[PDB]
């Protein structure tokens with residue numbers, strides 16, 4: 001059973017205009033089997049549009065590629081991002097709801113630290129009473145953590161089924 005193709009794709013921005021399907025593939029095949037690899041080009045001039053995409057055989061291979069950033073492809077540092085879940089909302093912060101009053105910082109840290117490096121955990125409290133409001137924000141050092149988090153169907157933290165969204 002293969003993972004949905006959308007979850008196996010990486011949009012690669014910032015390409016050198018000299019990058020080709022072949023050189024993009026030769027680069028990204030270091031981290032997994034590529035089922036597709038395309039440089040976007042103008043339909044008339046064939047000049048590169050400066051971005052492209054690669055599709056790996058598995059999600060674990062996407063993770064491997066993202067963990068190997070920064071990627072310097074044909075002399076230029078590129079910007080890989082997972083496919084949208086059609087514009088990417090590139091953020092480093094999530095809202096975590098449904099955590100009730102008994103969820104503490106270590107619950108959120110022990111879970112979310114496996115998605116990425118955490119910089120801030122903010123457990124929301126009531127401005128008047130100080131009581132926990134049942135939601136939190138987690139800020140990571142990089143957007144890929146958030147991208148991995150929000151495409152999961154479920155998040156279980158401190159026994160609670162949590163609702164997690166990108167936060168601006």
Ligand SMILES: CC(C)N1CCN(C(=O)c2cccs2)CC1
Nearest residue numbers: 001003058059060061062063064
């Ligand atoms: C066959 C399947 C159950 N394998 C279990 C391990 N595995 C992962 O842990 C993944 C990590 C990131 C996304 S997939 C997918 C491969």
Ligand SMILES: CC(C)N1CCN(C(=O)c2cccs2)CC1
Nearest residue numbers: 011081082083084086087088089
């Ligand atoms: C066709 C082209 C102009 N689109 C603009 C760039 N784009 C994104 O913002 C991304 C999607 C997923 C990760 S990046 C999608 C492609």
